[PDB]
Amino acid sequence: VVKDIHFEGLQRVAVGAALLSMPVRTGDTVNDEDISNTIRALFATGNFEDVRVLRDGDTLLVQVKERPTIASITFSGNKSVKDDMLKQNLEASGVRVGESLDRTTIADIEKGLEDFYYSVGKYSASVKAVVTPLPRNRVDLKLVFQEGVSAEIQQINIVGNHAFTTDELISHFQLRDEVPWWNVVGDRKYQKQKLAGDLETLRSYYLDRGYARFNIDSTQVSLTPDKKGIYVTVNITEGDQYKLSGVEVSGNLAGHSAEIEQLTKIEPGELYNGTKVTKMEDDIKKLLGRYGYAYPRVQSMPEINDADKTVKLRVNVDAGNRFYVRKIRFEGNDTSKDAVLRREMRQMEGAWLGSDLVDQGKERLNRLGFFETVDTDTQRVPGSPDQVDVVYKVKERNTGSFNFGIGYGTESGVSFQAGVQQDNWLGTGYAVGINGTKNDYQTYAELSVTNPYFTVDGVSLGGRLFYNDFQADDADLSDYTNKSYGTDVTLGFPINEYNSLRAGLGYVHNSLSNMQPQVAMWRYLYSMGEHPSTSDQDNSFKTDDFTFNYGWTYNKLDRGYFPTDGSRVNLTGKVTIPGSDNEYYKVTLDTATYVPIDDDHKWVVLGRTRWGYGDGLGGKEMPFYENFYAGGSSTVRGFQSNTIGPKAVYFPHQASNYDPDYDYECATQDGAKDLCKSDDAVGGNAMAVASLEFITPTPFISDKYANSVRTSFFWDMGTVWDTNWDSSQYSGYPDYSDPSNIRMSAGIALQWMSPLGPLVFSYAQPFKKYDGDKAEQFQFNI
């Protein structure tokens, strides 16, 4: 009968919308039934509570408190707690952002926080949840969280225990009392499931020991009202050990019996403690799994006699799921081709269960480190109780490489230190490595190329193609210039997947023109018989050398991006066949080892070392450029890069075809005109380098962050002695014939492997060197 009335001020669910929301539909015979209906439904809707029946004439006229709906939660207070559990416990509490606000639910989140603390352990229920209806539609929720409490749990209440020393048990456990000053290995803390796990710790412990009546029964939790001194008590019910002299088994495995018989081949004296035969059962388990099963039901049910202490074990042994074979599949292959990943696999359809297959595929993936969710899904392919589908996940990141150095040559032709790596180029089935250091007058050009396959038997399309025209130009180039040019390309049929002595082709010739005026250079050419000069840097050598070499490589590594189980081994040795200017016997040696010193593995010790020596044509000095430089760069830092060992002394020279005046420090146009102390370290013919360092998570970053960020600390030790050296002329200057060039320095190294930036920030503070080593203070690597 109503007009769905006038409102000088209506805003929300309205004249009509409110008209019907309450039992006040225009056109109704309304009774007080409807009035109470209005009142209650107003409370009820959980969108609006300013509840009344205020009729002018009899027309409802209202001061409103318009508050729809929940709008501003304010998770006030989050100490080590995040706002997300607050939000999730919020919808758990039945309200949320976007929820109808029924002011009823309030205390729940109090509880929703309060009780929450329990599941952590530590409990300080301080849950200040206050709501401010802001009167147009807005709501501001103040969610003030006080929980001052810790799970610092040390009640080693270990009782029922008279077989294994309480302390031994403690050592089994994760609640100790002292922080080592030698290594972080201790535990003291809580969770319900830490509880259970430790329960099993001691339990497995016992039953393993051969216990067969051991159980645990006492669990009495207590905390002081101060909420920190956490004492909880536990007791057990021990078992009985045994000695074993009895055995039974029943097999329906189709034909592997006396292979078990003598596969164990015990004789009449051997002791009961159970996990021994648990590994006997694993024996026969994977025995059949390889034979061609997947899921036989096989148990070893024991007995309990002490009335003669006489125990006999029985085993039921099924045959299992022989032949479930279906195609393999992939997921997460998105820029890689199916075919290349299939080139990875070694699996074969049309067989029976092989763990070795799938798990090796896992690891082969792990090797790659471009992309990682190493997932072999091998469920029963539905239906036809005859088969099993095979399917595979991986998670990827855009991974690509380039290294160079800052400057210089932006004032000049845009100068390039261009070493660039697609690593999706193996997405071409083969990967090429390229870096040229096309420096103003240093034209370094290399080629590295590998398809892992000429042929799948292991032969890998591996080639190394070299030239540099090197000039070394600041004010001239006739100090020296090289057309230097050589290629080494592999050939090997690696029959064992860790044995390789191979026979690839190794050649260089170089054109060496107008070399430098330094004493080693002179005597080396004298050694070549090519007696060198006295005042220029102008001379000739055309070097043509012929290689017969063998070398062996052995690497077991898990993770491709970042291993943990690091054992990588690479050895080269060159016996140089004649027509080579030097028939050098060159030995080059390098190893690296991650030992993940923990099973969380966050803690990995890294040791890396390298030998380099040349013994070849006893009868020549060495064609020099086979030299060793190392130090002060990354394997060592704080010092000049690759500067160690033997120095570089100039000889009085007055040309190079123009070495310029105001020249090298001495023995030339600058300073001293005669032989002098020109000490510029270059190293000798036996080099040795090694880093001794540790790797540890900065956990102050997200699991993603540390997944991309690595933090370690190094001791960087190197020495290089020239086996062929003088004291007679070095009657005043230092010498090299055995490891004495040992130094000290340590550094902090930080690397973030962000997809576009692999980032190196280092502070290695140099704390020992020798003569010829210069200081290095601040620069930020690649």
Added chain:
Amino acid sequence: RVVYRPDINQGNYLTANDVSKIRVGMTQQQVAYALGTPLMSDPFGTNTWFYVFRQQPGHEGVTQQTLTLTFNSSGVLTNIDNKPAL
């Protein structure tokens, strides 16, 4: 290298035993689930079935065991196909 190759298999092994478990004819369902997966699914026509194991172990030995049956009905056969290495 024509000298060596890593060994070669096409498995799901068997023997004249489960063969003896089997004979001329019984429903394509039963035997189909009995001797295992149908190794070579005839596409078209003849329900021609091909239990063949293949083995090439490294330049001295072999096993090409080939089997074929025909089930053109409720699962009826009169088909002989067994042979060792070839």
Added chain:
Amino acid sequence: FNSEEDVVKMSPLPTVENQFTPTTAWSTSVGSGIGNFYSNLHPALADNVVYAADRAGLVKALNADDGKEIWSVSLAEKDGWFSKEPALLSGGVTVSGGHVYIGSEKAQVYALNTSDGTVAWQTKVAGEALSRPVVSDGLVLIHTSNGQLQALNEADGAVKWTVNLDMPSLSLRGESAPTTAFGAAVVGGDNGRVSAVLMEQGQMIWQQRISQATGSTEIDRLSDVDTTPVVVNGVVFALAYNGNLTALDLRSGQIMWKRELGSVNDFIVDGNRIYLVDQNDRVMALTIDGGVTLWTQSDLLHRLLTSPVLYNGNLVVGDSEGYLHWINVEDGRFVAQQKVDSSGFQTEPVAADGKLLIQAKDGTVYSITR
């Protein structure tokens, strides 16, 4: 590293009146001993003698004396995976006349009927130790708050009636231990339902659900709920672990005088005359008239108390760090003029006549009277 806690209201020392001299006639230590580790320490006095024991069960007797303390029974067991491991020190102590009754950390009963010094009767029994040994006529009867009843009965060393009762998940630091009133083996609500197992051979006489002995319901717990009984005038004032009042007599829930006003820390509810200190650190001396009394000086805030021992009208309630609080006739008012072994206060004292008996965490026997 250090961000897990929030501020607490604490009101350490706002007022002291020097109108009491807390003098000492002796003040002695034999040194912890105590450490910080729960048990029933208190300066129990037998016939003018307190036999002070520090750790490794070292007893030395100060017998109402200006501080000489010698009855050398310095005893941790001869043995163990440590061969005299003295720590893990919580023992049941009783002196009946001249007999000492000691259980050691795991129900270890020792009857030192002091005549030679260390009197060598021991029986070692399994289980654990929480409360005092209640010797009802040769019957060393104990409830430990694992809901356990033990009757070490020394005509053989132990005649065993084992009555293990209900328990909740959290062990009640309000311990149940036998309180005998007229054969009334009065032992409280193990989940809050007060049980009688009176010994005839071990005999659960009666129960009656009273209240909550809290172990798993997320409710009010903070107040020092000494879930412990005070049977007096028949009417039993057994604190229950939810902080609500109840009075039972005739054994019985036939009365449950349950006036709740809140929850308390320190109680001696002596007949009708109640001495109650809340977690507010507010003490009332309740003379019930329907159960209404709050004389709140929460002007002290959240300091752990020790059992308020009254003497000369003088309810001296000891709260940690050199403070004992001597509520004389006027209620709930005293003067806080303090000198003791300020070595923290952490468990109940047992007092005696109008004097004071105190035992320190570091010191042992200090005679802080007037």
Added chain:
Amino acid sequence: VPDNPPNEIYATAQQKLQDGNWRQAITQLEALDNRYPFGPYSQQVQLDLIYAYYKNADLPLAQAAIDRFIRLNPTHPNIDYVMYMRGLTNMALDDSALQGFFGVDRSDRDPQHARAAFSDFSKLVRGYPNSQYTTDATKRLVFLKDRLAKYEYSVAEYYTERGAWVAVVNRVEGMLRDYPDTQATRDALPLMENAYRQMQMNAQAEKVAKIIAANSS
């Protein structure tokens, strides 16, 4: 982000959309979605956001907005628009054109996004075979079928080399049951033939050769 009276909110937003800097517009529309959810903006704002996303080729944002609308509204007169765009984004999931350009293309990449595309499109046509959308549907349908024919070709001939030539066989049987209508499939037919060769299986080889002759590709 505006909270004008809300049509001028939604208008400063769409002002940034027609303005084309669709990012700021999306900010503005979300703020409108941030402030007032009670009524039917969701419909209007959601179309704005989906269209802007997918024209920016904001592929997963497009999926998200589409799905959260179809949850807000799983039946309006714009079913064709939305379901069409879903098939499209499922396609876009399979292949991305950013490295495809020094001479690169993805022809045997993620099967399952193509799965989602084929599902969406065949679903839509068997529901709605009457739109400008339907034409795109059939076009890209045959396209992807042929595409994954080539994917299969890649993979199976890979085996063929690798020597799963019998597994090759049954794969080819697979594409057979899939479709004999695209040219790689034609080409494959001889591959099964090759299997018959190398696996000594003779009359079958004769037969497959005849089929190679018969459909002549």
Added chain:
Amino acid sequence: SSDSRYKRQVSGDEAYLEAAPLAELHAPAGMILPVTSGDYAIPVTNGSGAVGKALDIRPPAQPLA
């Protein structure tokens, strides 16, 4: 990707307007050729919407709001 598209019709070839030979495979009438297993048949449409480019790339409709 814009190769004169992304403005009024779908990307990809228009050669799937001229897609692969969808040809009945050949053998005499009266043989079963158990090839075929799916929803892939393309009917003779009359449309069934717009064929080509000038179509709506635009949503089939838009509400002013």
